[PDB]
Structure 1
């Protein structure tokens, strides 16, 4: 069967690809693969864009080297990446930990609401992962945090942050200058700046999504209206639907327009909402 047809391999024979398509987006196709060295299944991802400039691919090679030496139990593990030659163009392959239980976003669609104990636990694990990344030397900023790339190991398991280090390549992809997902992007990111606090802003919106089970700014007609609102400090309408005042208050501190007024991650971890139990 399916697991007997290895239709691709890394140069070393470590990773094998099976013709089992497990998902597809506009950036990436994901296939089930095998790590022959540990026997664990992995996610073998193939980038849709086969016309990235030499310079884009070179920069990503340097990025993948750093990603390959980072590990934390709340971060989806990055194993390797290389360029395969498929047809007429350089197809980039990434191999990552296989996540078998979907995302926070699909969890919210399935269960409709998140219980406040589950919220607290998962938000705390996201915060530990970000805090790990922010305290490396040098610091690593994710830049593209959202509910869609936060994975779970099971409905009562643990959270892993996905897509670390792919924001530059996602921007290059199809030469479209996509900077991120408007709903989660701090105001300063449209001026081409980022610091650690963009991740605090995005964490705040993830928390807003988990507390309300709706996408932030779903009232907005398009990304332009979101841009205008965020860069004048107009909150998403869902902020007033937040039912737990402590939660509301954390979200408020995370999404402040002025980056310097936002909570630090350490502030967040010591908050009574998280520090309790």
Structure 2
């Protein structure tokens, strides 16, 4: 008999089918044996966490189960197990197979202005939802590659919330952090939800320009110099819509105190609906 893995409740079953593999995370196809709907069985492990960091990892993953929002990926279950002699986190999520904003831009080359306005508003809705939880949830790792879509003319859903919690730790932040999207205060000890606004601005810039922000830079230190010197990414001057350009500028300001808030963005006339 083959050993088949299950959730502690027995509801979710793991397939021996690997869907994706990255740092700290391997995604397998799974099955809800009660509804007979296929899911994503995500196994997370950061072997360099301390005991207190792993425990916080376990607790933050378990809080994802209670999240229910149209623009957040659905996280059905979570528990702590062991993998290769050390603890790991399993995270069962809805199966996203329709691509991301990244694969969307690579497929359709450019994003039409009405699509950008609609999907950017939905990202702000999801971030507003995360920021108003108890305790508040900071994404810390928002990028076009982890904003999933339900279809070419569907909705967006913020994902990879389990992996994103590892940005709070040293080793993982240097491995999975995308410096082009990270606000400058993320290289300090303490920061707040304004880093999600900064990353949102870079997502909006990438959507508005169909290119990688700060692609002209070679490493994080180069980007950090430009950001802290008030030097915008070169793609910023390719934004054709002056209203979109004004919103991006307000989101990627180097000083957090001058940065626009989520409430300011949703109350902006561009996102009025």
Asked if these proteins are the same fold (TM beyond 0.5), I'd say yes
- Residue 191 (structure 1) aligns with: 188
Segment drifting more, 170-179 vs 223-232: 170-179
- Matches of 2:186 and 2:10, distance apart in 1: 41
* Offset at residue 176 of structure 1 (A): 6.8
Segment drifting more, 60-69 vs 178-187: 178-187
- Matches of 1:56 and 1:189, distance apart in 2: 18
* Offset at residue 214 of structure 1 (A): 1.0
Question: Which among 244, 249, 261 is matched to residue 246 of structure 2?
Answer: 249
RMSD: 2.2
Question: Which among 129, 133, 138 is matched to residue 135 of structure 2?
Answer: 138
* Offset at residue 170 of structure 1 (A): 4.8
Preserved CA contact (<8 Å) 2:24 2:44: yes
* Offset at residue 102 of structure 1 (A): 1.4
- Matches of 1:198 and 1:40, distance apart in 2: 35
Question: Residues 170, 258 of structure 1: CA spacing in aligned structure 2 closer, same or farther, 3 A cutoff?
Answer: closer
Partner of 1:189, secondary structure, is helix
Question: Residues 113, 179 of structure 1: CA spacing in aligned structure 2 closer, same or farther, 3 A cutoff?
Answer: closer
Partner of 2:157, secondary structure, is strand
* Offset at residue 204 of structure 1 (A): 0.5
* Offset at residue 50 of structure 1 (A): 4.7
- Matches of 2:211 and 2:232, distance apart in 1: 14
Question: Residues 59, 135 of structure 1: CA spacing in aligned structure 2 closer, same or farther, 3 A cutoff?
Answer: closer
- Matches of 1:39 and 1:136, distance apart in 2: 30
Question: Residues 91, 136 of structure 1: CA spacing in aligned structure 2 closer, same or farther, 3 A cutoff?
Answer: closer
* Offset at residue 155 of structure 1 (A): 0.7
Q: Please give the per-residue CA displacement for 1:203-241, whole angstroms capped at 9, x wherever unaligned.
A: 101000101111111000112211222222211111001
- Matches of 2:186 and 2:176, distance apart in 1: 8
Q: Please report the TM-score for the alignment, with normalisation by the length of structure 1.
A: 0.89
- Matches of 2:196 and 2:72, distance apart in 1: 14
Residue 215 (structure 1) aligned with residue 192 (structure 2):
no
Q: Please give the per-residue CA displacement for 1:134-181, whole angstroms capped at 9, x wherever unaligned.
A: 223342221111111100011111000012253342554866755831
Q: Please give the per-residue CA displacement for 1:18-76, whole angstroms capped at 9, x wherever unaligned.
A: 12221112221111111123322211112354564433321111112222222211101
Segment drifting more, 18-27 vs 130-139: 130-139
- Matches of 2:26 and 2:163, distance apart in 1: 14
Q: Please report the TM-score for the alignment, with normalisation by the length of structure 2.
A: 0.91
Q: Which runs of 5+ in 1 are unaligned?
A: none
Question: Residues 267, 85 of structure 1: CA spacing in aligned structure 2 closer, same or farther, 3 A cutoff?
Answer: closer
- Matches of 1:143 and 1:158, distance apart in 2: 22
Question: Which among 160, 163, 185 is matched to residue 160 of structure 2?
Answer: 163
Question: Residues 90, 140 of structure 1: CA spacing in aligned structure 2 closer, same or farther, 3 A cutoff?
Answer: closer
Give matches, 1:90-169, under 5 Å.
90-169=87-166
Q: Which runs of 5+ in 2 are unaligned?
A: none
Preserved CA contact (<8 Å) 1:51 1:89: no
Question: Which among 63, 80, 86 is matched to residue 77 of structure 2?
Answer: 80
- Matches of 1:243 and 1:48, distance apart in 2: 43
Aligned length, in residue pairs: 271
Segment drifting more, 184-193 vs 48-57: 48-57
Segment drifting more, 110-119 vs 18-27: 18-27
